[PDB]
Design an enzyme around this catalytic site. Structure first.
Site, PDB file in Angstrom:
ATOM      1  N   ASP A  16      -9.584  19.206  35.205  1.00 23.10           N
ATOM      2  CA  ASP A  16     -10.947  18.782  34.886  1.00 23.10           C
ATOM      3  C   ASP A  16     -10.948  17.528  33.992  1.00 23.10           C
ATOM      4  OD1 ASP A  16     -10.329  20.072  32.435  1.00 23.10           O
ATOM      5  OD2 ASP A  16     -12.351  20.946  32.246  1.00 23.10           O
ATOM      6  N   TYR A  72     -11.433  14.740  30.830  1.00 22.00           N
ATOM      7  CA  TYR A  72     -11.339  14.763  29.357  1.00 22.00           C
ATOM      8  C   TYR A  72     -12.746  15.121  28.837  1.00 22.00           C
ATOM      9  CZ  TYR A  72      -6.925  12.127  29.782  1.00 22.00           C
ATOM     10  OH  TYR A  72      -5.637  11.762  30.085  1.00 22.00           O
ATOM     11  N   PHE A 106      -6.063  11.978  34.793  1.00 22.43           N
ATOM     12  CA  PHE A 106      -5.179  11.395  33.759  1.00 22.43           C
ATOM     13  C   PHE A 106      -5.631  10.090  33.107  1.00 22.43           C
ATOM     14  CE2 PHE A 106      -2.563  14.142  36.523  1.00 22.43           C
ATOM     15  CZ  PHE A 106      -2.139  15.095  35.613  1.00 22.43           C
ATOM     16  N   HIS A 108       4.242  20.201  34.220  1.00 21.11           N
ATOM     17  CA  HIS A 108       3.131  19.360  33.759  1.00 21.11           C
ATOM     18  C   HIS A 108       3.565  18.306  32.716  1.00 21.11           C
ATOM     19  CE1 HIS A 108      -0.835  18.254  32.233  1.00 21.11           C
ATOM     20  NE2 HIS A 108      -1.288  18.640  33.431  1.00 21.11           N
TER      21      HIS A 108
END
Lengths: 229, 50, 49
Positions: A73, A75, A86, A195
């Site tokens: 999702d 920021y 990102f 991740h």
């Protein structure tokens, strides 16, 4: 009921994405998803702003996509998210996971000229599709809009993109991306890693997806991605 | 299969402290949330709920 | 440098729970600590000291 012309004008969607997105307007879930988004917008501070929600359709066309990088999702603080996974707005110092992504690029390519910034529009224009499965978020609450229908809608877009022709590169980082998105590994180049979060079992700086994806593109006679950013 | 609640007390660049509540996340989701955190951590609570 | 008190309630493979306490860690120390934890996390508490 839901008209494509109205939908793309309201969300500033590039019409080149029409064959891949317009069929979603026949899914009854879409009407519930849009009404829930319209209602949240009136009762809470929703990010990214409306004009940015679908910025990922504006950097390149479906036929120019070469790599798919899956996110979760956006920021949840003002000024951070702009519609790409990102990536952060230009004036924003890269948050910890994004710094780890940028260190892995630099370890893969010691001669790459890195700016120190975290805006990934350059990659997006080059066919690097940076796609979150959830397109909106309530300020200050991670995954707050994760159960209103975005992942089903986006899931549909990815499936049709993948079906167009074989040979996409998928970079699936962390458990969530790997469980949700499962392309056929004989049709597409499927790359998996832990991740980029500093909390992962293995340092992300050791990830070589950027080199592996470029060696794959060369075997298909496609020019490599310049990962400098 | 485990689910978690996450509470943070953070401090912004102006010195103002504020709470953030993140409910029913997987442990992997918490790890992603942490990697997106930019403000100064004053307190962090992570609790298994199921 | 911010230092922290880090507390974990962990569960071993037999289903037995236990606390581990760490005083004066930096956030980098906490990250290496978290990354190296193998037993199941029941609670995590990180507090600036």
């Amino acid at each position: 009921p839901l008209d494509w012309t109205t939908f793309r004008r309201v969300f500033l969607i590039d019409d080149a994405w029409r064959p891949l997105m317009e069929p979603e307007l026949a899914n009854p879930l879409t009407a519930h998803l849009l009404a829930e988004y319209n209602r949240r917008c009136q009762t809470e501070e929703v990010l990214p702003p409306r004009e940015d929600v679908f910025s990922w359709t504006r950097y390149c066309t479906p036929d120019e996509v070469r790599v798919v990088i899956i996110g979760q999702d956006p920021y949840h603080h003002p000024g951070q998210a702009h519609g790409l996974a990102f990536s952060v707005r230009a004036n924003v110092p890269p948050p910890p996971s994004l710094r780890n992504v940028l260190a892995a690029v630099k370890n893969c390519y010691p001669e790459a000229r890195m700016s120190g910034h975290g805006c990934l529009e350059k990659w997006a224009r080059d066919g690097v599709l940076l796609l979150n499965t959830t397109l909106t978020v309530k300020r200050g609450a991670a995954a707050s809009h994760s159960r209103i229908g975005w992942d089903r809608f986006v899931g549909g877009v990815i499936r049709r993109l993948a079906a167009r022709r074989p040979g996409l590169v998928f970079m699936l980082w962390g458990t969530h991306a790997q469980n949700a998105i499962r392309p056929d590994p004989r049709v597409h180049c499927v790359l998996k890693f832990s991740h980029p979060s500093p909390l992962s079992k293995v340092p992300f700086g050791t990830c070589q997806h950027f080199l592996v994806a470029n060696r794959y593109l060369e075997t298909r006679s496609i020019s490599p991605i310049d990962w400098s950013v | 299969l485990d689910s978690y609640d996450v509470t943070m007390l953070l401090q912004d660049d102006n010195g103002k402290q504020y709470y953030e509540y993140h409910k029913g996340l997987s442990l992997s989701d918490f790890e992603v949330l942490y990697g997106n955190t930019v403000d100064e951590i004053i307190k962090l609570r992570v609790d298994k709920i199921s």
